Design a protein around this ligand. Structure first.
Ligand code: UWH
Ligand code: UWH
Ligand code: CA
Ligand code: CA
Ligand code: CL
Ligand code: CL
Lengths: 9, 228, 228, 9
């Protein structure tokens, strides 16, 4: 089950 | 630590650290920028969130590796090392929560910034809950829930159903329900309702906004496929 | 830092840190193990080398990203941050070199251990040379060369031409020649002679040793393909 | 031009 990766920005 | 560096230099260095994949540096630069005491722009909020999600993401992946070895093992070394990684992870989560509490949330008056920070608050309590054991787990879980719920209430009143922050909040709160709160049916209901309400609002979007919203909708769909 | 932890616990934790991809921890555990003052076994030497190669490999990749941005830019932030990463990299290389000099090399009497440590010494001087600028570059380059040459002289006298450490030493010294010493013809000659002499000795090897040697031979071939 | 990766063991 995946949360927002949110690792790039 | 970063008190002598200009705010704008800290922001610039956080962007360089991201390019160099130096996420610990990036988090330290963004912590320094927050501690200047000014509100953060949309771009700066994203830099703060990306930095810490990478730092804590590496810690969580390591904690899971060590927890798995330790479970299989049942000398003190595996537990000791898992504990060290766990304490470090808790320290980073406490640092982020401290930034949100002093004073990012209270100064966030627009819905976009307030929802963003409350989603962060829910996420970092959720990461604390992943490693918590017992009744401490209960209060940490309730703190995550409360932060996500406040963010949800604002987002439903103030943002369209396709807003990417609204969508990512709903995604992460659904994961909270499934993985932390032992409420898989609530997780599935939230992901389905969020997906369907976004679908119905796609016609209002430009090409670029459509791409942004449908990317996160696909994440909701991926979870629903796994859960149903 | 690690003076109160048992040697065997440091070794065990270094293996766990590798599994968890916590290479800074792994390097700190292995530094602590070296500082116990006993010689390292073959496995322990490999843990030490893997830990530091990962740490310095991340620093080198970041330094290259920042150096590229800085070259393109020609405020102070890019240079300042490149300098910070560079100083950190130099500090890690100096730490490894200090372990080799106090006292891993002088206590290494068997060819396998002495060649291993001298290859490390050449590699870490080579990493210093990558960031050095001017006449300092000259003496650092000569230190790398001298370490690699001593390792080469021992390896040719004491190990078969298929020995993986002998092969990896020759590979890395060839890269030194090509990338640092501006001697591409020496790089190509060394890689070719090393490959050919290994090929001719493959018939002596078991299946498992054959796999070990041919893997590194393929790296020599990959470089020759790029250089010729 | 590649050195020994040497990142796993
Ligand atoms: C928690 C969360 C929700 C949505 C995203 S995103 O769609 O990947 N995105 C939102 C903002 N956006 C633009 C900012 O300019 C830098 C970047 C990321 C990510 C996390
Ligand atoms: C510098 C260098 C040369 C060769 C290698 S390797 O072939 O990948 N290899 C040698 C020793 N070996 C066995 C040790 O047991 C853990 C592991 C790696 C690597 C670097
Ligand atoms: Ca200022
Ligand atoms: Ca002891
Ligand atoms: Cl405000
Ligand atoms: Cl000895």
């Amino acid at each position: 089950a995946g949360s927002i990766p949110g690792r790039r920005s | 630590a970063m008190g002598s560096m200009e705010r704008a230099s800290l922001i610039q260095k956080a962007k360089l650290a991201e390019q160099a994949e130096r996420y610990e540096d990036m988090a330290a630069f963004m912590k320094g920028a927050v501690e200047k005491g000014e509100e953060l722009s949309c771009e700066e909020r994203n830099l703060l969130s990306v930095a810490y999600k990478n730092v804590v993401g590496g810690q969580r992946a390591a904690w899971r590796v060590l927890s798995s070895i330790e479970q299989k093992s049942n000398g003190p070394e595996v537990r000791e090392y898992r504990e060290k990684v766990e304490t470090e992870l808790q320290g980073v989560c406490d640092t982020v929560l401290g930034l949100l509490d002093s004073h990012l949330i209270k100064e966030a008056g627009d819905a976009e910034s307030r929802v963003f920070y409350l989603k962060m608050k829910g996420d970092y309590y959720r990461y604390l809950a992943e490693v918590a054991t017992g009744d401490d787990k209960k209060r940490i879980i309730d703190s995550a829930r409360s932060a996500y719920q406040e963010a949800m209430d604002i987002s439903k009143k103030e943002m369209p159903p396709t807003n990417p922050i609204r969508l990512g909040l709903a995604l992460n709160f659904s994961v909270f329900h499934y993985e932390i709160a032992n409420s898989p049916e609530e997780a599935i209901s939230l992901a389905k309702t969020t997906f369907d309400e976004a679908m119905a609002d796609l016609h209002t979007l430009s090409e670029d906004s459509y791409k942004d919203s449908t990317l996160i909708m696909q994440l909701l769909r991926d979870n629903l496929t796994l859960w149903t």
